[PDB]
Design an enzyme around this catalytic site. Sequence first.
Site, PDB file in Angstrom:
ATOM      1  N   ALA A   4      19.629  44.118 -25.505  1.00 15.00           N
ATOM      2  CA  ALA A   4      18.845  44.341 -26.667  1.00 15.00           C
ATOM      3  C   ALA A   4      19.617  44.413 -27.708  1.00 15.00           C
ATOM      4  O   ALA A   4      19.167  43.798 -28.827  1.00 15.00           O
ATOM      5  CB  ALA A   4      17.773  45.714 -26.491  1.00 15.00           C
ATOM      6  N   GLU A  10      40.863  27.647 -23.177  1.00 13.06           N
ATOM      7  CA  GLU A  10      42.294  27.467 -23.742  1.00 13.06           C
ATOM      8  C   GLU A  10      42.982  27.580 -22.533  1.00 13.06           C
ATOM      9  O   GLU A  10      43.731  28.637 -22.087  1.00 13.06           O
ATOM     10  CB  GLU A  10      42.451  28.804 -24.460  1.00 13.06           C
ATOM     11  CG  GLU A  10      41.540  28.665 -25.745  1.00 13.06           C
ATOM     12  CD  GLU A  10      41.676  29.699 -26.694  1.00 13.06           C
ATOM     13  OE1 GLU A  10      42.635  30.304 -26.956  1.00 13.06           O
ATOM     14  OE2 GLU A  10      40.534  30.204 -27.191  1.00 13.06           O
ATOM     15  N   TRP A  51      40.297  33.051 -25.898  1.00 15.94           N
ATOM     16  CA  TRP A  51      41.855  33.366 -24.939  1.00 15.94           C
ATOM     17  C   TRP A  51      41.607  34.300 -24.227  1.00 15.94           C
ATOM     18  O   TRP A  51      42.123  34.067 -22.804  1.00 15.94           O
ATOM     19  CB  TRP A  51      42.910  33.807 -26.014  1.00 15.94           C
ATOM     20  CG  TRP A  51      44.182  34.074 -25.272  1.00 15.94           C
ATOM     21  CD1 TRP A  51      44.841  35.101 -25.102  1.00 15.94           C
ATOM     22  CD2 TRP A  51      45.089  33.031 -24.920  1.00 15.94           C
ATOM     23  NE1 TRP A  51      45.909  34.983 -24.461  1.00 15.94           N
ATOM     24  CE2 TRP A  51      46.216  33.565 -24.252  1.00 15.94           C
ATOM     25  CE3 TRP A  51      45.204  31.687 -24.861  1.00 15.94           C
ATOM     26  CZ2 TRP A  51      47.431  33.077 -23.781  1.00 15.94           C
ATOM     27  CZ3 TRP A  51      46.221  30.905 -24.357  1.00 15.94           C
ATOM     28  CH2 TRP A  51      47.307  31.734 -23.745  1.00 15.94           C
ATOM     29  N   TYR A  52      41.099  35.598 -24.471  1.00  8.74           N
ATOM     30  CA  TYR A  52      41.107  36.828 -23.293  1.00  8.74           C
ATOM     31  C   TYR A  52      40.394  36.153 -22.171  1.00  8.74           C
ATOM     32  O   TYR A  52      40.918  36.286 -21.077  1.00  8.74           O
ATOM     33  CB  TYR A  52      40.145  37.709 -23.988  1.00  8.74           C
ATOM     34  CG  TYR A  52      40.166  38.969 -23.027  1.00  8.74           C
ATOM     35  CD1 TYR A  52      41.404  39.759 -22.580  1.00  8.74           C
ATOM     36  CD2 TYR A  52      38.984  39.158 -22.475  1.00  8.74           C
ATOM     37  CE1 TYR A  52      41.150  40.906 -21.678  1.00  8.74           C
ATOM     38  CE2 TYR A  52      38.834  40.561 -21.642  1.00  8.74           C
ATOM     39  CZ  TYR A  52      39.814  41.065 -21.272  1.00  8.74           C
ATOM     40  OH  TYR A  52      39.783  41.919 -20.416  1.00  8.74           O
ATOM     41  N   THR A  58      44.533  24.895 -35.291  1.00  8.73           N
ATOM     42  CA  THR A  58      45.757  24.502 -36.128  1.00  8.73           C
ATOM     43  C   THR A  58      46.364  25.884 -36.963  1.00  8.73           C
ATOM     44  O   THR A  58      46.592  25.745 -38.107  1.00  8.73           O
ATOM     45  CB  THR A  58      45.449  23.238 -37.241  1.00  8.73           C
ATOM     46  OG1 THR A  58      44.145  23.420 -37.656  1.00  8.73           O
ATOM     47  CG2 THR A  58      45.765  22.126 -36.434  1.00  8.73           C
ATOM     48  N   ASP A  61      48.587  29.784 -35.370  1.00  8.91           N
ATOM     49  CA  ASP A  61      49.384  30.336 -34.503  1.00  8.91           C
ATOM     50  C   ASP A  61      50.414  29.280 -34.276  1.00  8.91           C
ATOM     51  O   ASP A  61      50.747  29.208 -32.971  1.00  8.91           O
ATOM     52  CB  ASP A  61      48.390  30.569 -33.315  1.00  8.91           C
ATOM     53  CG  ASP A  61      47.798  31.917 -33.371  1.00  8.91           C
ATOM     54  OD1 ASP A  61      47.764  32.881 -34.357  1.00  8.91           O
ATOM     55  OD2 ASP A  61      46.979  31.972 -32.392  1.00  8.91           O
TER      56      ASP A  61
HETATM   57  N1  LIG Z   1      44.583  39.543 -32.705  1.00 13.38           N
HETATM   58  C1  LIG Z   1      44.999  38.435 -32.594  1.00 13.38           C
HETATM   59  N2  LIG Z   1      45.803  37.871 -32.045  1.00 13.38           N
HETATM   60  N3  LIG Z   1      43.916  37.434 -33.233  1.00 13.38           N
HETATM   61  C2  LIG Z   1      44.138  36.171 -33.398  1.00 13.38           C
HETATM   62  C3  LIG Z   1      42.832  35.455 -32.345  1.00 13.38           C
HETATM   63  C4  LIG Z   1      42.822  33.827 -32.420  1.00 13.38           C
HETATM   64  C5  LIG Z   1      41.453  33.366 -31.908  1.00 13.38           C
HETATM   65  N4  LIG Z   1      41.541  33.579 -30.586  1.00 13.38           N
HETATM   66  C6  LIG Z   1      40.658  32.698 -29.932  1.00 13.38           C
HETATM   67  O1  LIG Z   1      40.554  32.730 -28.684  1.00 13.38           O
HETATM   68  C7  LIG Z   1      39.520  31.880 -30.637  1.00 13.38           C
HETATM   69  C8  LIG Z   1      39.188  30.637 -29.962  1.00 13.38           C
HETATM   70  C9  LIG Z   1      38.480  29.815 -31.028  1.00 13.38           C
HETATM   71  C10 LIG Z   1      39.509  30.104 -31.968  1.00 13.38           C
HETATM   72  N5  LIG Z   1      40.232  31.245 -31.673  1.00 13.38           N
HETATM   73  C11 LIG Z   1      41.126  32.203 -32.553  1.00 13.38           C
HETATM   74  O2  LIG Z   1      41.441  31.670 -33.447  1.00 13.38           O
END
Ligand SMILES: NC(N)=NCCC[C@@H]1NC(=O)[C@@H]2CCCN2C1=O
Lengths: 496, 497
Positions: free
Chosen positions: B67, B142, B95-96, B211, B213
């Site tokens: 809900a 990913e 990612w997680y 684009t 990290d």
């Molecule tokens: N705490 C941190 N590391 N934050 C950065 C997360 C970046 C983030 N990670 C993801 O999995 C998603 C997938 C779509 C784009 N995402 C991100 O930029």
Amino acid sequence: TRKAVIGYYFIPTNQINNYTETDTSVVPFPVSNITPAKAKQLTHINFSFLDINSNLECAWDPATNDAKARDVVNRLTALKAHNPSLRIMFSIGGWYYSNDLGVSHANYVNAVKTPASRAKFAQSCVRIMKDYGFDGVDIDWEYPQAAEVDGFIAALQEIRTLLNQQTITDGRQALPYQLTIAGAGGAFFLSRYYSKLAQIVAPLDYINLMTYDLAGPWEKVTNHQAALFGDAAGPTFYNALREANLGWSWEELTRAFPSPFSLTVDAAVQQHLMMEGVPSAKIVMGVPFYGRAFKGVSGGNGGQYSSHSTPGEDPYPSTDYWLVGCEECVRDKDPRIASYRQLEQMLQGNYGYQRLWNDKTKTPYLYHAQNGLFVTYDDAESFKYKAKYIKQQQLGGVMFWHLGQDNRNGDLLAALDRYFNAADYDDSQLDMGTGLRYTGVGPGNLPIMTAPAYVPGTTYAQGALVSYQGYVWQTKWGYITSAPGSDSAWLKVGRV
Amino acid sequence: TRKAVIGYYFIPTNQINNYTETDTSVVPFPVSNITPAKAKQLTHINFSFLDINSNLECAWDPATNDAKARDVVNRLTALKAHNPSLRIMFSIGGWYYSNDLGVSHANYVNAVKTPASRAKFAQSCVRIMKDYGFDGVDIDWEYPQAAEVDGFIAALQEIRTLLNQQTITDGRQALPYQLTIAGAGGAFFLSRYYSKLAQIVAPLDYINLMTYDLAGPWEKVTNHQAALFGDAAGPTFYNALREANLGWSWEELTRAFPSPFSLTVDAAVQQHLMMEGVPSAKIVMGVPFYGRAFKGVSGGNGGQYSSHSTPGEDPYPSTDYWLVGCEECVRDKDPRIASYRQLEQMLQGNYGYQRLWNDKTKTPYLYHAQNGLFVTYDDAESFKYKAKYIKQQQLGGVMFWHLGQDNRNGDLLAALDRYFNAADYDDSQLDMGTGLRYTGVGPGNLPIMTAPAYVPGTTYAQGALVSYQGYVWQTKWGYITSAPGSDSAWLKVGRVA
Ligand SMILES: NC(N)=NCCC[C@@H]1NC(=O)[C@@H]2CCCN2C1=O
Ligand SMILES: NC(N)=NCCC[C@@H]1NC(=O)[C@@H]2CCCN2C1=O
């Protein structure tokens, strides 16, 4: 296992059609010159050359006098009386007939095109073998191109099937009919079919590398035409194999094919051993019984690595026979090639030649300081190092072009036989020198290595090593979270 | 065509379950922070994240109060009243959940395996989409690799078929259901599926490149995490695309993938454009609304390209919160990442940071001379160069992570919208700089060239150029008597008009 000693017996149609053993003016090297002693030093004689005709079948030159041809061949097979291991093979092709621009090239391309053309072609090879009394088939197409390779491979497989059947039908288990080819001994031509070497060599008893003509008037600087190892002072070449149709990665291509590199006999042999499925025992090292001469060279390195003014076209586009003392060159209207026999005579003739030796390439050469001439050739000395390499590398043996170019005493052939077989010849201390070795690494010659088993779930750093599926792998970068074979970050670097 | 502006709205399961719009210590960024003005500046909001369960269907985290989940999503879809072009997409993965070592990775691999599993999974995506009121599906695995890619492609194709039918069934032709994915923004991860990019992108409306990290504590040298162009003074990297299963020759690989190279936003975009069949219009440039911080940096170049002493493990293994003035970092327990909102506050907080600018990379950075800190981030100024690049390169738009990190006034989102649409913004004279551009050329993006037709029976010298079967070819060595094509001697260098 006895090393193969394969010598070509080449005879032009005009010489067959006028065959005689009593007049060197007509036939310079008749079969009678192959004495019992020489027959015993050979394991194979490749009679050359036959061709493939527009009917897409193996066949003699249309101008050949068949009855004269049969008699020459019978004289060769008669030599088997002196050596029960001797085989008289016949060779199809050669540069003249089969090069891309050769008179019969399309026949080679067309004969391997279809299951039917191949069957007809293979059958004709065996029929010719049986009708004339030959002991095997050697094909010297110089050379099949990428799109023609599968057809070529299939043709070889078909001939192999027919020959094996013929061996049983003829009770030839003790000396089975054989199939060989003359393979490229330089990366440029080799790149045409390199990717499928294993499939090409599978149906063969031997692949005879033309590891000579690696220098010639078609090149800007003079060089040794059959250097065993490299000389850093000499010219280097683009490594064409990196452009072969392999489907390998950049790291794989780079580690296997350094470029530029030294075009040597060692390079060619190692390039073949780098492919998996290519056994060293089937690789035969070809050596030349002739030298290549250049004019217009300058001093400083004895004529070596110098610019020159030698015409590279065929036929020799001139009437100026400038290789001093070479009488055979006048007979053959080309001063750019001279038999070992003729070179030996030129050396004992006080014509102004100095015999020099390159201890890196382990080959001799002549320098004529007065006329500015350079000759690259091979002799009984260079043959010691090549024979030792054949034994160390566990190669199948040696091939050479051609018998009529050895001297009258058959010294070059005698030396090869001595090095492999004489009980009182010991090359255990022969120093192979410091010349450049080809260091490419490929799927077929990976070193034995050990490393911890790959563990699913582990994250690997860059440069880490693991064993998986029987090979040792290394990571190309870091944070690798998947397995070798499924994650491109892994590079196969070793085996076992 | 209006440029896409895709912003992620990320909310953890615990925040959904305790959702409130009156307690920032519980929900730092409630949907109520997205005003009508902000809703009009966005074209898409990617609600994140949903997952793929062990039944191999799209699903919410099992711990989600359903809900409460519907209520959060409703707050988002209600924004559509303010912008008839707005779509509330939902993202599966992240990612997680989906990294190789992630809790649900197996479910992604197995769901795309067979026609049956793909059909089941695609049907579940459309069911979730309709049940909760979303306007499209976004998949953020990913990343798939090896044998998984063909399955992934077929799953995307299947979802596309189902969405198109749903569009017709619902009479949604005016705002068709959409399908997108988040794609790698760096060559290392991109190499996993690079060879099949055209097939991956065919069923998508957009591929949103992550684009950013592109620098982090996991690297030994500090650097900008989202440089638009390269700085010859910064670190360079091995071009991993050289190792993808492409079937290109050494020359082709070398020409397409210069190495080492500068890991930049321009490199990722150009690398996608190098592949035949990938239209620029579907490429979306991602930008970060957060910065990454490093400690233990040296002086001299404002903390840029310096060795550092920043922990790389996740989670942050220490209790030491060394990013001065970053209380958010304390709340979240990691001094290595900070929202633009927080970084802007640190700049108004007189804490000893100098805001510097690299005119090659076109990005800002912070340097704390006293404490030896370096922060790479993006802001409204760096977005001017990136928005101009998006226009010049005819890209589909911009994507960003994430909405909660913009400042309270929504200035970063406002800037992007302004750069693409405001009549009173004029970037015609904005100088893009001399930073390093990615210059790789792929057999799938050859220039038009002109050469005499190949003449069979001719012998070609080294470097000769000929036209044959639609391409211009160059010889790599001499005495070439073979015809252009697979034969090793010839290199495809251009396309025949
Ligand atoms: N705490 C941190 N590391 N934050 C950065 C997360 C970046 C983030 N990670 C993801 O999995 C998603 C997938 C779509 C784009 N995402 C991100 O930029
Ligand atoms: N006139 C010249 N160049 N003579 C050297 C001939 C080398 C000779 N030519 C080929 O095609 C055969 C194929 C088998 C090995 N071959 C040779 O050595």
